Design a protein around this ligand. Structure first.
Ligand SMILES: N=C(N)c1ccc([C@H]2[C@H]3C(=O)N(Cc4ccc5c(c4)OCO5)C(=O)[C@H]3[C@@H]3C[C@@H](O)CN32)cc1
Ligand SMILES: [Ca+2]
Ligand code: NA
Lengths: 250, 6, 27
């Protein structure tokens, strides 16, 4: 996270770290949506252009963390993956359309002060909160600068941007399954996700029921925190039928 | 720079 | 049923340092 701040303890209890077993390294962010399901970006697990194709045994999920590198004894929980489900129409060739994947854990994780699931939006949630100018929150242990790693989880609040502005900022084809967020050059404020933060959650706190909802998944960007560029996020509600289908079937 | 895990 | 309610924040009616920035943007 570039131009963010240290998160408070227990601020994002649904935050998940996807950790590569060998070599040991931060692979991506993710989120806890139930005691046995974790949500992330498809590109974190499958991206042929870079010969990325992880299988269940290549990684671990670490839940309840705060420190990036430390093993947080008596606090974090480490979980193994039973099965990975990538959206069948994930478009890695053109624009990362439908950048979403689910991971089922081998055993349910117990909730605690530091481990708790985030809500997924329904159609009304989406319509109410997904508006230009409304701010969401992105969290992660990724780079602090485009070109530099944090001691602890970083957080930044960013405004959803009008669709025409998002479209006009890039040569990539934007779809209805994406939204973008970030400040404009004239707004003064800054902040963006970066390498290591992708797959993590973009959340919003409903002012109606005071619950946190994951509206997006950190999907892509050109550079990090560049003026005139914006971060793109997978539109979670738009892909909820697929999420439900997978969880209902498996 | 990751601390070893159990 | 308890999704999205943080044990160290909403459950005990404590607010984090920047959540008010989000609420203020929901105009
Ligand atoms: N908000 C950001 N600045 C940002 C968000 C995510 C990424 C991701 C993601 C990203 O931007 N691209 C590049 C890319 C962009 C658009 C594409 C694409 C690849 O293929 C089709 O369309 C990736 O590969 C993913 C890669 C995985 C990690 O290392 C980090 N990086 C980078 C910057
Ligand atoms: Ca364009
Ligand atoms: Na920018």
């Amino acid at each position: 996270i570039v131009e963010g701040s240290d998160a408070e303890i227990g601020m994002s209890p649904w935050q998940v770290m996807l950790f590569r077993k060998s070599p040991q390294e931060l692979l991506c962010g993710a989120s806890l949506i139930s005691d046995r399901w974790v949500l992330t970006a498809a590109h974190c697990l499958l991206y042929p252009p870079w010969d990325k194709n992880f299988t269940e045994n290549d990684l671990l999920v670490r839940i309840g963390k705060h420190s990036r590198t430390a093993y947080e004894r008596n606090i974090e929980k480490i979980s193994m993956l039973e099965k990975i489900y990538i959206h069948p129409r994930y478009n890695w060739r053109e624009n990362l359309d439908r950048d979403i994947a689910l991971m089922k854990l081998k055993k349910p994780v117990a909730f605690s002060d530091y481990i708790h699931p985030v809500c997924l939006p329904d159609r009304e949630t989406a319509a109410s909160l997904l508006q230009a100018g409304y701010k969401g929150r992105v969290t992660g242990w990724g780079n602090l600068k485009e070109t530099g790693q944090p001691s602890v989880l970083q957080v930044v609040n960013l405004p959803i941007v009008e669709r025409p502005v998002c479209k006009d900022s890039t040569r990539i084809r934007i779809t209805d399954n994406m939204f973008c967020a970030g400040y404009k050059p004239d707004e003064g404020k800054r902040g963006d996700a970066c390498e290591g933060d992708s797959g993590g959650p973009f959340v919003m706190k409903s002012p109606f029921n005071n619950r946190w909802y994951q509206m997006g998944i950190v999907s892509w960007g050109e550079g990090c925190d560049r003026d005139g560029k914006y971060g793109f996020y997978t539109h979670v509600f738009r892909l909820k039928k697929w999420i439900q289908k997978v969880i209902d079937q498996f | 720079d990751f601390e070893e895990i159990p | 049923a308890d999704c999205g309610l943080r044990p160290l924040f909403e459950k005990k009616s404590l607010e984090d340092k920047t959540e008010r920035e989000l609420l203020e943007s929901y105009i």
